[PDB]
Structure 1
Amino acid sequence: VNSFSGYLKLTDNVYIKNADIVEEAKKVKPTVVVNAANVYLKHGGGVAGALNKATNNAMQVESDDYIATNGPLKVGGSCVLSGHNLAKHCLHVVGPNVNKGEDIQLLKSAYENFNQHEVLLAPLLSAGIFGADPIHSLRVCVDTVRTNVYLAVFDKNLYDKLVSSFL
């Protein structure tokens, strides 16, 4: 039993809600919140820009030190950093950005990072400003993640379409 509330159950291990992931994180304070990161951990917009703003830019300061030490992530890769005021940890996961020409096949690799964590709050990888089809992202999530994932979908219209079209 966990403290996630109001989710629709899609499968044995995947749940979905129409919610602002920032507000969800502030309420639940989960062990792991997933960020829709880029390889440079530049949290300018989308989910990443919103999560960083909620940390008063502390996520960005920590991220800049991480990159200065380690260099960029791989597309499809991840790193674990602090969750600041939002969660214990933030798993920064890089899904392919279709608006940069990146291979959508890497979306499965991106979701595989979730399997290293028993429970996660997360957005749909590569959705939104990353330019991929959120319906496809949901399918890859369900077919790849085996740990317990609570998906927050900000857009109500998109949330309704994802549920109604789910197979």
Structure 2
Amino acid sequence: VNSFSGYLKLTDNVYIKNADIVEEAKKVKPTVVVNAANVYLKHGGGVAGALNKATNNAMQVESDDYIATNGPLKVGGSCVLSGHNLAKHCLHVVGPNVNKGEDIQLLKSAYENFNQHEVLLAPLLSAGIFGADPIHSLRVCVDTVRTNVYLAVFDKNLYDKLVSSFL
């Protein structure tokens, strides 16, 4: 039993809700919140810009030190950093950004990072400003993640479409 509330159960391990991931994290304080990161951990817009703003830019400060030490992530890769005031940890995961020409096949590799964590609060990778089809992202999530994932979909219209079209 965990403290997530109001989610629709899609499969044995995937749950979905129309919610602002920032407000959800603040309420639940999950062990792991997933950020929709880029390889430079430059948290400018979308989910990443929103999470970082909620940390008063502390996420960006920590991220800049991470990059200065380690260099950029790989597309499809991840790193674990602090969750600041939002969660214990933040798993920064880089899905392919179609608006950059990146291979959508890397979306499965991106979701594989979730399997290293027993429970996560997450967005749909590569959706929104990353330019992929969210219906496809949800399908890859369900077919790749085996740990317990609580998906927050900001757009209510999109949430309704994601639910109605789920196979």
Shorter-chain TM-score range: over 0.9
Helix, strand or coil: the match of 1:74?
A: coil
Instruction: Give the superposition deviation at 1:55.
Output: 0.0
Distance 1:149 1:165 in 2: 19
Alignment deviations for residues 35-93 of structure 1 (CA, whole Å, 9 cap, x no partner): 00000000000000000000000000000000000000000000000000000000000
- The offset of 1:10, in angstroms, is 0.1
* 2:15 aligned counterpart, secondary structure: strand
Question: After superposition, what is the alpha-carbon deviation per residue over 1:8-47, rounded to whole angstroms, capped at 9, x for unaligned?
Answer: 0000000000000000000000000000000000000000
Q: Matched residue of 1:90: which SS? A: strand
TM-score, with structure 1 as normaliser: 1.00
Identity %: 100
The alignment partner of 1:96 has SS state of coil
Task: Give the SS at the match of 1:138.
Answer: helix
* Correspondence 1:85 to 2:66: no
Aligned length: 167
Secondary structure, aligned partner of 2:91? strand
What is the alpha-carbon distance in structure 2 between the residues aligned to residue 56 and residue 73 of structure 1?
23
| Residue 6 of structure 1, CA deviation | 0.1
Find the aligned partners of 2:30 and 2:9 in 1 and give their Cα distance.
Answer: 18
2:146 and 2:15 map into 1 onto residues whose CA distance is: 12
Q: TM-score, normalised by structure 2?
A: 1.00
Structure-2 separation of matches of 1:92 and 1:113: 10
The CA deviation string for residues 135-154 of structure 1, in whole angstroms up to 9 with x for no partner, is 00000000000000000000
Provide, for residues 87-144 of structure 1, a one-character-per-residue CA deviation record: whole Å limited to 9, x for no partner. 0000000000000000000000000000000000000000000000000000000000
| Gap regions ≥5 residues in structure 1 | none
What CA distance in whole angstroms lies between the structure 2 residues aligned with 1:159 and 1:6? 13
Alpha-carbon RMSD across the aligned residues, in angstroms, is: 0.1
